[PDB]
From Swiss-Prot, chain B:
Organism of origin: Mus musculus (Mouse)
Upper classification of the organism: Eukaryota, Metazoa, Chordata, Craniata, Vertebrata
Entry protein name: Small ribosomal subunit protein uS10m
Subunit structure: Component of the mitochondrial ribosome small subunit (28S) which comprises a 12S rRNA and about 30 distinct proteins.
Keywords attached to this entry: Mitochondrion, Ribonucleoprotein, Ribosomal protein
Transmembrane segments: none
Entry GO MF terms: structural constituent of ribosome
GO cellular component: mitochondrial inner membrane; mitochondrial small ribosomal subunit; mitochondrion
Highest taxon above the source species: Eukaryota
UniProtKB/Swiss-Prot annotation, chain C:
Signal peptide span: none
Protein name: Small ribosomal subunit protein uS3m
Keywords: Mitochondrion, Ribonucleoprotein, Ribosomal protein, Transit peptide
GO CC annotations, alphabetized: mitochondrial inner membrane; mitochondrial small ribosomal subunit; mitochondrion
Subcellular location: Mitochondrion
Protein origin, superkingdom: Eukaryota
Part of the intact protein present: 36 to 167 of 167
Family from the record: Belongs to the universal ribosomal protein uS3 family.
Keyword Cytoplasm: no
Source organism of this protein record: Mus musculus
Swiss-Prot record, chain D:
Biological source species: Mus musculus (Mouse)
Subunit structure: Component of the mitochondrial ribosome small subunit (28S) which comprises a 12S rRNA and about 30 distinct proteins.
Record GO terms (molecular function): protein domain specific binding; structural constituent of ribosome
Protein name: Small ribosomal subunit protein mS31
This protein's UniProt keywords: Mitochondrion, Ribonucleoprotein, Ribosomal protein, Transit peptide
UniProtKB/Swiss-Prot annotation, chain E:
Name of the protein: Small ribosomal subunit protein uS14m
Top-level taxonomy: Eukaryota, Metazoa, Chordata, Craniata, Vertebrata
Keywords: Mitochondrion, Ribonucleoprotein, Ribosomal protein
Keyword hit for tRNA processing: no
Subcellular location: Mitochondrion
Assembly and interaction partners: Component of the mitochondrial ribosome small subunit (28S) which comprises a 12S rRNA and about 30 distinct proteins. Interacts with LIAT1.
Protein species of origin: Mus musculus
Stated family: Belongs to the universal ribosomal protein uS14 family.
GO molecular function terms attached to this record: structural constituent of ribosome
Coiled-coil features, chain-numbered ranges: none
GO term, biological process aspect, one: mitochondrial translation
Gene expressing this chain: Mrps14
């Protein structure tokens, strides 16, 4: 019923992960962010905090981890199109030239979502960056499956 | 591709070891085929490939072999009437010189993977090594 | 008179392909070999096994593509790879060919323990070299 | 403004001064871990883009020969050595040290040393066969003045 | 099904000679020498005789694998002269041509 209670509960599971000397993995953070996509409005500050904690721990954000932050910051059913967020530009700068490998089950989803956000913003310069990232190394393998390859 | 080009193509990992490398004084590659034209095209591909990697190469044509045998033309009797068949083997020898063991593996793979159908190779590596440490010093 | 592999003359109404028109004495002169392997070269082994495999591979493709073969198949062996190149008439629907290719490759790769690939070039109809 | 890596963090966890302390294979791969790996591969599973990619896959699966060609690839005769194949007189200790049986077994072991089509284990079986054969024929040998074992 | 009953008997002769190859080698070695007592050689002469007749490797006949023809076979291809000519005259043997010279 209450998000604040719900969020504090999930955090309690994380606090018991340190009491038992259990270190989190990439999937742990990806799972938390995938859950946050429900509360677009209130999940923005929590979601960014997770990614900062991911780097400090030493876990490297994968394509799936950004796929979830984009959904949470650029809703498809977004009435407030007047002033969209600029995070997509920073993400692409962060990932410029990096090569990625399969490390999660949502890595394929990232590219299809990134192009969609480019079409919504009508920025063709950003679309070139996204496609340019797809061509570096063997990133082409994470474009997506049959449903998401033709959408991209 | 006109506008869409790979950006940073991935390249295989080549790690230099600490083991010393083999030294091949000579490396004779005898290709065999029923067709002379195929050997001419393969000889051009192999000589061009060697020259592009810095390898020293020479080519000569060993004499061809023709194996002929006779068979009985009829199914029954008619002994004196026969049919003869032959198989022709043609050779092209690519004699390489002064190759390290890494250069001989990459070259042989590249040319062996591109060996046309109907062509057989016979590589004859000739390694050069020092004397055995025991033999170096006479011990009674 | 010699009868071997000779398509005889009738009244000028019998279509024959280039392969059929040429008698055995034109082999290596006007027409090449349908199979190309290294087993009949000098000092080479396993000729009998390559020849037996070819006989079977030709009967298999005839039955698997009944009435869909425009000409004899060409077999190409490189390393342990086998390549079957067949001219096939455009009779069957396109999706049916994709089924028979996947089936014939997997079945012949698990039967001879080598990678087998099928190469199909579709012709509108049999190509006639001459009418004899 | 919305800096991706500048700002407050959860801070529930601490910097990993100790990293990956427990080994990745804490136990033999479970069904849960074995199946998750199969799904990770499918994430990047795309069809072949050219004949090179197809041949690479066949090579990883053992379907296609490795190059340069090695006619003895995967063919190790129990990790033996030349001295094991060539010097076989150690196995003739049970046999008489001299006499006709020794003279015969010398010829037998000489041929076995020059046999490239048999393994060391198979060659020993040939020697063992004669040991039991002569043991059975102890009575005939004794008549001929040959003493076996 | 094999081509005929003659090819079937040959196949069994070839499979029983493979089983008794080591045995017939070890026993026959005791006979092909002059270093062992003649009493042992006379006894080994009967142990080899007692083995089944189909183990003897001289009872194998090379037959065309496709027609089971006993004579006229070419050992490199294992085919009769009639079957070989059908494959050769159609361009189906790799590198075989007619001999004109
Ligand atoms: Mg019958
Ligand atoms: Mg005989």
């Amino acid at each position: 019923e209450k998000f604040e209670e719900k969020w504090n509960d999930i955090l309690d599971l994380l606090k018991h992960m340190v009491a038992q000397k259990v270190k989190p993995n990439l999937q742990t953070f990806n799972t938390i962010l995938k859950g946050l996509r429900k509360c677009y409005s209130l999940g923005r500050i929590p979601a960014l905090q997770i990614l900062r904690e991911m780097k400090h721990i030493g876990i490297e954000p994968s394509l799936a981890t950004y796929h979830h932050i984009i959904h949470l910051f650029y809703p498809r059913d977004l009435s407030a199109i007047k002033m969209p967020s600029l995070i997509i530009y920073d993400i692409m700068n962060e990932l410029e030239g990096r090569t990625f490998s399969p490390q999660d089950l949502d890595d394929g989803r990232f590219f299809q979502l990134a192009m969609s956000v480019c079409s919504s913003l009508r920025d063709l310069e950003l679309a070139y960056q996204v496609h340019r990232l797809l061509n570096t190394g063997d990133n082409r393998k994470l474009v997506g499956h049959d449903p998401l390859r033709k959408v991209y | 591709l006109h506008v869409d080009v790979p950006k940073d193509v991935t390249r295989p990992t080549i790690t230099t070891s600490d083991e010393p490398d083999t030294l091949y004084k000579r490396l004779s590659i005898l290709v065999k085929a029923h067709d002379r034209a195929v050997l001419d095209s393969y000889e051009y591909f192999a000589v061009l490939a060697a020259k592009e990697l810095g390898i020293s190469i020479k080519v000569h044509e060993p004499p061809r072999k023709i194996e002929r045998f006779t068979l009985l033309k009829s199914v029954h009797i008619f002994k004196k009437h026969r049919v003869q068949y032959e198989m022709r083997t043609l050779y092209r020898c690519l004699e390489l010189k002064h190759l390290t063991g890494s250069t001989a593996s990459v070259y042989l793979e590249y040319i062996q993977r591109n060996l046309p159908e109907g062509v057989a190779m016979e590589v004859t590596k000739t390694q050069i090594q020092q004397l055995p440490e025991h033999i170096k010093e006479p011990m009674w | 008179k010699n009868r071997a592999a000779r398509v005889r003359v009738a009244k000028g109404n019998k279509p024959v392909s280039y392969e059929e028109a040429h008698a055995p004495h034109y082999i290596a002169h006007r027409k090449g070999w349908l199979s190309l392997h290294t087993g009949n070269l000098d000092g080479e082994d396993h000729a009998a096994e390559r020849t037996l495999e070819d006989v079977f591979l030709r009967k298999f493709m005839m039955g698997t593509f009944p009435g869909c073969l425009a000409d004899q198949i060409v077999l190409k062996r490189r390393a342990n790879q086998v390549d079957i190149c067949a001219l096939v008439l455009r009779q069957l629907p396109a999706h049916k060919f994709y089924f028979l290719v996947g089936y014939s490759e997997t079945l012949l790769s698990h039967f001879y323990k080598c990678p087998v690939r099928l190469h199909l070039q579709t012709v509108p109809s049999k190509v006639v070299y001459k009418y004899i | 403004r919305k800096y991706l890596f500048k700002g407050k963090r959860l801070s529930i966890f601490a910097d990993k001064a100790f990293a990956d302390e427990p080994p990745e294979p804490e136990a033999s791969p479970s069904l849960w871990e074995i199946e998750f790996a199969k799904q990770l591969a499918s994430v990047a599973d795309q069809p072949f883009e050219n004949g090179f990619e197809e041949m690479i896959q066949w090579t990883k699966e053992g379907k296609l020969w490795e190059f340069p060609v090695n006619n003895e690839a995967g063919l190790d005769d129990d990790g033996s050595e030349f001295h094991e194949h060539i010097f076989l007189d150690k196995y003739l200790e049970d046999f008489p040290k001299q006499g006709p049986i020794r003279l015969f077994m010398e010829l037998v072991t000489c041929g076995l040393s020059k046999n490239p089509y048999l393994s060391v284990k198979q060659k020993v079986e040939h020697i063992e066969w004669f040991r039991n054969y002569f043991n059975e024929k102890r009575d005939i040998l004794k008549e001929n003045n040959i003493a076996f074992t | 099904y094999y081509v005929d009953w003659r090819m079937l008997r040959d196949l069994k002769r070839r499979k029983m000679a493979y089983e008794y190859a080591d045995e017939r080698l070890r026993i026959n070695s005791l006979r092909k020498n002059t270093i062992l007592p003649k009493d042992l050689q006379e006894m080994a002469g009967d142990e080899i005789a007692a083995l089944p007749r189909d183990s003897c490797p001289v009872r194998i006949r090379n037959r065309c694998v496709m027609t089971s023809r006993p004579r006229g076979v070419k050992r490199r291809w294992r085919l009769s002269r009639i079957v070989f000519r059908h494959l050769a005259d159609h361009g189906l043997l790799s590198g075989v041509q007619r001999a004109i010279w």
